[PDB]
Design an enzyme around this catalytic site. Structure first.
Site, PDB file in Angstrom:
ATOM      1  N   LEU A  19       0.806  -1.186   0.000  1.00 57.23           N
ATOM      2  CA  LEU A  19       0.000   0.000   0.000  1.00 57.23           C
ATOM      3  C   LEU A  19       0.859   1.263   0.000  1.00 57.23           C
ATOM      4  CD1 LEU A  19      -2.780  -1.046   2.464  1.00 57.23           C
ATOM      5  CD2 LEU A  19      -2.875  -1.008  -0.035  1.00 57.23           C
ATOM      6  N   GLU A  21       5.150   2.967   1.052  1.00 58.79           N
ATOM      7  CA  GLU A  21       6.502   2.822   1.569  1.00 58.79           C
ATOM      8  C   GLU A  21       6.943   4.164   2.158  1.00 58.79           C
ATOM      9  OE1 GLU A  21       9.470   0.838  -0.966  1.00 58.79           O
ATOM     10  OE2 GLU A  21       7.751   0.292  -2.232  1.00 58.79           O
ATOM     11  N   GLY A  22       7.633   4.101   3.263  1.00 55.48           N
ATOM     12  CA  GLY A  22       8.163   5.295   3.926  1.00 55.48           C
ATOM     13  C   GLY A  22       9.532   4.976   4.503  1.00 55.48           C
ATOM     14  N   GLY A  25       9.892   1.672   6.527  1.00 58.98           N
ATOM     15  CA  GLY A  25       9.480   0.316   6.029  1.00 58.98           C
ATOM     16  C   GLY A  25       8.300   0.471   5.096  1.00 58.98           C
ATOM     17  N   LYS A  26       7.286  -0.367   5.261  1.00 61.61           N
ATOM     18  CA  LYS A  26       6.160  -0.354   4.355  1.00 61.61           C
ATOM     19  C   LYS A  26       4.887  -0.719   5.025  1.00 61.61           C
ATOM     20  CE  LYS A  26       7.227  -4.890   2.624  1.00 61.61           C
ATOM     21  NZ  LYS A  26       7.776  -5.570   1.435  1.00 61.61           N
ATOM     22  N   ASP A 140       4.284  15.329  12.577  1.00 60.86           N
ATOM     23  CA  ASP A 140       4.398  14.971  11.174  1.00 60.86           C
ATOM     24  C   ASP A 140       3.096  14.948  10.411  1.00 60.86           C
ATOM     25  OD1 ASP A 140       5.890  14.522   8.739  1.00 60.86           O
ATOM     26  OD2 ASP A 140       6.047  12.406   9.161  1.00 60.86           O
TER      27      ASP A 140
HETATM   28  C1  LIG Z   1       4.344   6.360   4.080  1.00 62.19           C
HETATM   29  C2  LIG Z   1       3.574   5.142   3.663  1.00 62.19           C
HETATM   30  O1  LIG Z   1       2.360   5.173   4.472  1.00 62.19           O
HETATM   31  C3  LIG Z   1       1.287   4.439   4.076  1.00 62.19           C
HETATM   32  O2  LIG Z   1       1.520   3.758   3.106  1.00 62.19           O
HETATM   33  C4  LIG Z   1       0.220   4.131   5.017  1.00 62.19           C
HETATM   34  C5  LIG Z   1       0.347   4.500   6.440  1.00 62.19           C
HETATM   35  C6  LIG Z   1       1.290   5.315   7.183  1.00 62.19           C
HETATM   36  C7  LIG Z   1       1.872   4.924   8.274  1.00 62.19           C
HETATM   37  N1  LIG Z   1       2.377   4.572   9.252  1.00 62.19           N
HETATM   38  C8  LIG Z   1       1.414   6.599   6.856  1.00 62.19           C
HETATM   39  N2  LIG Z   1       0.888   7.288   5.776  1.00 62.19           N
HETATM   40  C9  LIG Z   1      -0.761   3.809   7.093  1.00 62.19           C
HETATM   41  C10 LIG Z   1      -1.222   3.763   8.337  1.00 62.19           C
HETATM   42  C11 LIG Z   1      -2.312   3.033   8.626  1.00 62.19           C
HETATM   43  C12 LIG Z   1      -3.070   2.420   7.674  1.00 62.19           C
HETATM   44 CL1  LIG Z   1      -4.524   1.536   8.057  1.00 62.19          CL
HETATM   45  C13 LIG Z   1      -2.664   2.487   6.316  1.00 62.19           C
HETATM   46 CL2  LIG Z   1      -3.649   1.678   5.073  1.00 62.19          CL
HETATM   47  C14 LIG Z   1      -1.447   3.203   6.008  1.00 62.19           C
HETATM   48  N3  LIG Z   1      -0.811   3.343   4.829  1.00 62.19           N
HETATM   49  C15 LIG Z   1      -1.235   2.884   3.492  1.00 62.19           C
END
Ligand SMILES: CCOC(=O)c1c(/C(C#N)=C\N)c2ccc(Cl)c(Cl)c2n1C
Length: 333
Positions: A19, A21-22, A25-26, A140
């Site tokens: 879904l 990546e940061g 991790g992912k 953030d």
């Molecule tokens: C930086 C990448 O973050 C996401 O990909 C992300 C992130 C994060 C984190 N941590 C930040 N955007 C998610 C947090 C909870 C849930 Cl339920 C989902 Cl689906 C998240 N996703 C898809």
């Protein structure tokens, strides 16, 4: 093949998609084989000390918030469980939809309709105010960390812009990513936030607290309204020059306090308007209210709120408790 599609975590969660990546991790989408094949999100953290630490901190924060608010009234993401998998901390979440950044991008950077902005802004302020009331600062906030609950949409031809436009069926959001969240009595990192959302007290290393989140929210709201950032920069001095063009001069007391002496000459920004970078800033930035797309009362009130959130002095900046009472939000009540 560990932590890649097809891997199975804690004997039940099968990775089926990445879904996002940061730096940490992912996040992956999994099928939960022990709950009828229903899908969940799993945050999989690098086996690298600083990310492990942050993840442990996130877990602690989510256990506090989710115990205080078990039904997510205040719209923080719900953690379902957590575990370790081959040295990686894994946090299981309710599956949410696209981030507000991904939705904008997928819509061709068309801005959100004002009625959606009002609902999203209120939810973000309610959520972050819940953190602030619990001696926490997120640090953030950005569109990529605000996720839609359900990103289903309808598509209609918009004859004004002569393109197809997507519109959310339901714009409800949750706030995510608590790995940087800081309690009042804990160590405060020197540098917080993602650059375009970073408050001036942070840039100037003056110290920060809850107000830095309020500056970030003001930046987010501008982005929802325009579909682009007003701070198109990757340099600190330039960022400050952009602020001056948009918001007016930095307060002298903040300039006097800072140790970031490279940015200043006498007690003024060391910035040559006639340089190439000066021309860039002059071309891309202008006084805040010049960005308004309508002079109607609802737009005027949104911009009054944004201007209060983008107050330079964190001691004077609007609090989210005060923001939640702002008249921009009345049409919700
Ligand atoms: C930086 C990448 O973050 C996401 O990909 C992300 C992130 C994060 C984190 N941590 C930040 N955007 C998610 C947090 C909870 C849930 Cl339920 C989902 Cl689906 C998240 N996703 C898809």
């Amino acid at each position: 093949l560990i932590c890649q599609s097809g891997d199975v975590l804690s004997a039940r969660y099968e990775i089926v998609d990445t879904l996002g990546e940061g730096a940490f991790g992912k996040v992956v989408e999994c099928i939960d084989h022990k709950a009828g094949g229903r899908h969940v999100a799993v945050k999989i953290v690098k086996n690298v000390d600083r990310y492990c630490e942050a993840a442990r901190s996130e877990i602690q924060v989510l256990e506090h918030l989710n115990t205080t608010d078990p039904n997510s009234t205040f719209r923080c993401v719900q953690m379902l469980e957590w575990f370790e998998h081959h040295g990686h901390i894994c946090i299981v979440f309710e599956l949410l939809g696209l981030s507000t950044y991904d939705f904008i991008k997928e819509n061709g950077f068309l801005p959100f309709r004002l009625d959606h902005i009002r609902k999203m802004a209120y939810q973000i302020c309610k959520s972050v105010n819940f953190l602030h009331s619990n001696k926490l600062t997120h640090t953030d906030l950005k569109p990529e960390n605000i996720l839609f609950v359900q990103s289903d949409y309808t598509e209609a031809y918009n004859p004004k812009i002569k393109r197809d436009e997507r519109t959310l069926i339901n714009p409800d959001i949750k706030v995510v990513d608590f790995g940087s969240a800081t309690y009042d009595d804990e160590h405060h990192s020197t540098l917080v936030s993602t650059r375009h959302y970073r408050a001036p007290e942070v840039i100037l290393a003056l110290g920060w607290s809850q107000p830095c989140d309020v500056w970030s929210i003001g930046c987010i709201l501008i982005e929802y309204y325009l579909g682009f950032t007003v701070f198109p920069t990757h340099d600190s001095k330039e960022h400050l020059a952009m602020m001056e063009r948009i918001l007016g001069p930095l307060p002298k007391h903040m300039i006097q306090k800072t140790r970031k002496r490279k940015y200043f000459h006498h007690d003024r920004l060391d910035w040559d308007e006639h340089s190439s970078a000066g021309r860039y800033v002059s071309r891309r930035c202008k006084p805040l209210k010049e960005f308004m797309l309508s002079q109607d009362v609802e737009h005027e009130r949104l911009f009054d709120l944004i201007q209060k959130m983008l107050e330079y002095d964190p001691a004077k900046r609007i609090t989210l408790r005060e923001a939640l009472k702002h008249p921009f939000f009345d049409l919700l009540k």
